[PDB]
């Protein structure tokens, strides 16, 4: 369990009360967006958190540069295979954890992000289960 805190993901903004709409249950457990490997949606297909896929909502955006430091907060650091990052649904960067347990505070540096409005998807793959954790960040790159 864990979620991306900076730049804040959709479940982070819900849990911190930064959205102008009620997000439901996810507001109380942002660390729990868990779903089988292989998806590219913000919820991963977890039906209890379907609001995270609704793009009609006025989701807030974050202004960032093309090179940005991205921070996770883990509550239960499971042995990890890879951390995958997509930009608008297309794989951008991969980090290999070699099946090791990560630190509960973890920072990665993304580079070469395209300018304009985009949505990053962070996919955390657990090495000893069939599940991953899904985090979306809406951003404006300049
Ligand atoms: Cu867990």
UniProtKB/TrEMBL annotation:
Protein name: chitinase
Disulphide-bonded residues: 14-23, 42-136
Binding positions for Cu(+) per the UniProt entry: 1, 78
Residues at which Cu(2+) binds: 1, 78
């Amino acid at each position: 369990h864990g979620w991306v805190t900076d730049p804040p993901s959709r479940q982070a903004l819900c849990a911190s009360g930064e959205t102008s709409f009620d997000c439901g249950q996810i507001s109380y457990e942002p660390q729990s967006v868990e779903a089988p490997k292989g998806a590219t949606t913000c919820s991963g297909g977890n039906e209890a958190f379907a609001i995270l896929d609704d793009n009609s909502k006025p989701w807030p955006t974050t202004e960032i540069a093309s090179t940005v430091d991205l921070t996770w907060k883990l509550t239960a650091p499971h042995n990890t295979s890879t951390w995958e990052y997509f930009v608008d649904g297309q794989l951008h960067q991969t980090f290999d954890q070699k099946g090791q347990q990560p630190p509960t505070s973890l920072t990665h540096t993304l580079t070469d992000l395209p300018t304009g409005e985009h949505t990053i998807l962070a996919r955390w793959n657990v090495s000893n289960t069939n599940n991953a954790f899904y985090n979306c960040m809406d951003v404006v790159v300049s």
